[PDB]
Amino acid sequence: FSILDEAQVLASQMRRLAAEELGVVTMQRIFNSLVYTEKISNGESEVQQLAKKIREKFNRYLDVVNRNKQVVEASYTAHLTSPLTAIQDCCTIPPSMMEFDGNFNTNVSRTVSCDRLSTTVNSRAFNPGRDLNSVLADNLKSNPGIKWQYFSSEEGIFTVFPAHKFRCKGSYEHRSRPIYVSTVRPQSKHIVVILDHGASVTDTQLQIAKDAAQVILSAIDEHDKISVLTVADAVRTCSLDQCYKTYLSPATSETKRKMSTFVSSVKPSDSPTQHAVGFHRAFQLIRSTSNSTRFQANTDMVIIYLSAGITSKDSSEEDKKATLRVINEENGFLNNSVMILTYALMNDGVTGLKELAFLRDLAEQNSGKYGIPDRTALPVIKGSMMVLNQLSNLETTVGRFYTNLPNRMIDEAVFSLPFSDEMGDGLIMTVSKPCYFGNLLLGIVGVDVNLAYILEDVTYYQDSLASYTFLIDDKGYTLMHPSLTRPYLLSEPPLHTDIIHYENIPKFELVRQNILSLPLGSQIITVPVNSSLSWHINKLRETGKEAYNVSYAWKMVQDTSFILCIVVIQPEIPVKQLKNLNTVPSSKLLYHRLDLLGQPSACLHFKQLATLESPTVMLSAGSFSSPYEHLSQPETKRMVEHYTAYLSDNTRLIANPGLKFSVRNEVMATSHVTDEWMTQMEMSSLNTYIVRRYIATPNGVLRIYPGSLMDKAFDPTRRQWYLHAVANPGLISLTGPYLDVGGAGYVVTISHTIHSSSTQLSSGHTVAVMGIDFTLRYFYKVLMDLLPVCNQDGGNKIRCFIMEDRGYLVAHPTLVDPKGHAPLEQQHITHKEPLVANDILNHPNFVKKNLCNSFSDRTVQRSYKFNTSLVGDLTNLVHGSHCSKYRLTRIPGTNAFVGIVNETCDSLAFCACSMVDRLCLNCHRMEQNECECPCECPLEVNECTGNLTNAENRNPSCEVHQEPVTYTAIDPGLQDALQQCVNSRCNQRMESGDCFGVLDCEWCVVDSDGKTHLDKSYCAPQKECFGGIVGAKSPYVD
């Protein structure tokens, strides 16, 4: 019944874990005695320096294609004199292979380009690859980081410098790929494909019809617009969006995937094809699509049509008359701006020989043949017609539809958005230019760069704690932002989203217009704190703030379509930077690369190579001056010794081997945790309950004990325990349950921030956060030891719990289900205690249900937020005043709450929680008091305009739920040669209070049959009963 005095004692345990076991008070005292240098800036100086970095990378990027272009253009002048026709088949070079610097899939190289042949090439084709090897090698050796460099001729040959034996089971038709189309035809193409599947079309030739439609979709860019229509017996458009019934949508990967699946859903129909309605609909779409694109003209409209022998005998001519009439009428509303292309589907019988005449009449728009007079004094853009069979190469036929477009002879560089490499095994970006000799187009040249390398300057920008950067193009699409997933881990092209969605702040659309228009400038705006995202709030440097200033300093990158910007939070208030210090190492520094060393005594800590001899220090990719070079190239023992020498160099003599500013200063500043931790180990009784403790810094320093080996790409600044502590400065932050990276399974983490001084407790003053990890059962073992009331029964009718500020439970009477039998949010207060969850939603000012948009996975997330300023005690207000009284209060000094429930009789209470996914019950509206576990609803985005489908959806953006992380690998040869670091035998524990919390143990309660209670609960290693279910699967193999 009493909870207050019980909560104060529980708070002392939290301080005993944060201050004594972790060392927060010691490190805060040390960081308070350090000296700092203050800086004030609006971002104009930083946006100038950062623009230079990527401009130099794009200048060298443009100098390669410009050099490759002038060589192949001059090489054609030699072709007019000597036969430049060599053959170096890419499938005939098998002496060896390599993986040096990208190209990591069976790639030989060094002054030997390879050629791939299209079926269109003739024996007298122009092949400049013979002499082009002399320059392609110098381009790669002088510019490391670029992946591919190629020349694809208009005739059909594809020559790439790094020769790799790839895709020999077919032909690589590069001329049908979007990179080639966007170069030779840089105009915004508003295409609409009409797919006739009526008149009893045989499924044998509808095969070609639907396969061709996939070639169009997989060949256009985001500046092109597309619509796909059906038989027109009923004008069925794509049903995956509301705007697809009215407009043409930009050919984004979203629209492509939606239209492509809609193509494969087409099956034959016996109704006679109503062609006139299909062409009419296509015009109505093209008409209602704004004036062209309102974008530098260059808007060529084309209507592709795929059909065969419809006729209809009696009304055949009438069917032919109705189409060419409505074409002449609707294309007469336009200024004959629409071009028509037709394609024939043929077997040896159906289409015969006379049905092709109706398709050429459509391409030529031969309306006068049927009487209808061309009312427009303008001419008509005569199209073209091609025939297709089961032997047709759809890429060299229908894929070359862009050739029928006007070639305005644009000689300009074009930059592609991030996409997946078809030759390699990663994401790339491509700059390209066409090759022009007189009025003749020879082809295009293009070089591919790794996405992580070209963006390494904006992905890991850390010049100031009060600043961050984002990179966009002139159309608004975001290429890099703190809210995006890091490119090195991406195996799929992201959903390209406008900057108005990631920088979701009121009054920002004014700054957005100034960014896309003015090539250089800056502007400050005033924003309230209650309607903003965390990237701004976490950098506040004044407490009790109701509104804050933001500075946006932008500058377009020279000679490219990209624009870089610097966001400075509260620029009128200084930002502190750690001054260079000189601390001598009390203990020897140990780099985390224990595999390359092998000198200290090693052991396994879950799925990690670790040691108990001393803690380790890790530098994340981003602390180095070239983060892509650190991720791509192997880290060797030689480099580990160099970094160890420079970081522990107290003579100030060793030159910087490749580290960034403030990196070593934070390594020395945090070097005091070594003696602090190791001293506590000798006297602590919690060595069997603490899985690890650590401290992390904004500039990439990570010291953990037990010193373990981590993956290079690990960034602790983007983990939940880090961001949760920054949001709650000066408070103990409970975070969990979450899945551990090291292999400990589900864990709960106490995290705390370290500030520049104790007189300023704002989030922006965070110079480091520390964290300590415990197993899932630990905080219930604490709850049973600390509070005797929780033992009146075995957590049955009298239940105790600990709830974080999001609603998730870290202490529990029940925590076993984690498997296939319970909802995904089963660890939430709404699922485990639906009654008190319903009741606390009625307590005023205590709870608030939040909505945020996550454009990375097109969902809208619902969550809770109990404000951690709760003074006093909360009991039943509406529900359960008689049958289930409860007491809920905040644990002082932390973001958690302690609760006790006394279930005297049964009561009815539900909180909706899906047991098959995370979909909310009602996705039409959100109610604050409608109890439901955390859930998601699909985000409705208008793909025809790039905005939200409903304007009544201006929620903030979900900052980060970046799940992808490389869990550390363990393998035989090491598993059998070494043993676990801590081997507290779980077989010798006979009660729940003894087994709960032990890091390598679990209290089994369920038999291997799935859900049958055990007559004999016992303690066993975690491997034997995950979640207490004997024989359950590991949580990493979900």
Added chain:
Amino acid sequence: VCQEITVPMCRGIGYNLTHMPNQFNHDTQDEAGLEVHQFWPLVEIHCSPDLRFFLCSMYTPICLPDYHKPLPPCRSVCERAKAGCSPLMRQYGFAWPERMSCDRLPVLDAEVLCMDYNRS
């Protein structure tokens, strides 16, 4: 003596007269309104047009000033309510109380008066 329906969820169902205690031994309409409102998310999702009536006919049973006998819903409206909402209830954690099993209701049989509005 009958009293008017006060719980807003059960207004506009066909009647506005009830009498406490109900079948669940709720001593007031406020107590009964708190329990029946736990099904309100299922009513707004429209899994069955009979759901709001079936729930209200049990938590706020109809009171006629001249009948003086309990007038429960028929078994047909209970089955039509569960046929459209039960599979959704099993997915989102909702459960029917055992006192609301359709076997406890009269069939459309004998002179047991029940309340189905589609068979009127």
